[PDB]
Amino acid sequence: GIKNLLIALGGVLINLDRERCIENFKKIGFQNIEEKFGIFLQQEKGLITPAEFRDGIREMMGKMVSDKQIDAAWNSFLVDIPTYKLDLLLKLREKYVVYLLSNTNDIHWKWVCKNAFPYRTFKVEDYFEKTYLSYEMKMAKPEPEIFKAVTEDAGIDPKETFFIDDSEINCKVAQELGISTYTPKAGEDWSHLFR
Ligand SMILES: [Mg+2]
């Protein structure tokens, strides 16, 4: 009897495009961008600041570039949330409590909130009871920490929580804590889970 849902961000909701990102980075002067990915892991845990991140990018980049240029290229990894997934979220809150559990960074998070979640009258606030972000939490999937940490703050029973995330390891760890999981494939429309 599932009462709650935990949803990942990437692939599951927002389409990703590594090639594009790589290319945009190269265009702005980062030659070995693809070997490079450090600060990414730190950023993800919010152990540094967007400021220091850009500096790190510049620093290993060997050139001075605009923060906008950098945010631009970094955000090009994100494509879009097909709007039918947004409908699905809203429809789902009718029968469940719905949380986001996402490994991400402030720069990305602000892009998705401005550019991807806004739909009709709705805003990121409208889809989730609460969003748990790695870089705010300071811990990241698949640390067991983060899963236990989420249920306690949320005050939800793990036995009654369904976790949807396209990373196997993340799912296996969540299962250990008693959570049920589905691992969607790239591009998968996982709406079939509720037919
Ligand atoms: Mg993923």
Q: Are residues 72 and 4 in the same domain?
A: no
Sign of CA dihedral 132, 136, 142, 147: negative
Distance 101 CA to ligand 1 centre (A): 11
Q: Resolution limit in angstroms? A: 2.4
Distance 170 CA to ligand 1 centre (A): 9
CA distance 18 to 32: 14
45: closest CA among 136, 130, 131? 136
Q: Are residues 195 and 185 in the same domain?
A: yes
Q: Are residues 96 and 160 in the same domain?
A: yes
Distance 8 CA to ligand 1 centre (A): 7
Distance 172 CA to ligand 1 centre (A): 13
The pair of structure tokens assigned to 131 is: 């969003």
Return the half-sphere exposure (C-beta side, CA atoms, 13 A cut-off) of residue 92.
26
- 6: domain CATH number is 3.40.50.1000
DSSP characters over the chain: ---EEEE-SBTTTB-B-HHHHHHHHHHTT-TTHHHH--HHHHHHHTSS-HHHHHHHHHHTTTS---HHHHHHHHHTTB----HHHHHHHHHHTTTSEEEEEE---HHHHHHHHHHTS-BTTB-HHHH-SEEEEHHHHT--TT-HHHHHHHHHHHT--GGGEEEE-S-HHHHHHHHHTT-EEE---TT--GGGGG-
Distance 63 CA to ligand 1 centre (A): 31
Distance 56 CA to ligand 1 centre (A): 24
Q: Are residues 119 and 193 in the same domain?
A: yes
Could you list the residue range(s) of the whole structural domain that residue 61 is in? 14-81
Q: How was this structure determined?
A: X-ray
Q: Which residue has the tokens 């609460």?
A: 130
41: closest CA among 114, 117, 105, 85? 105
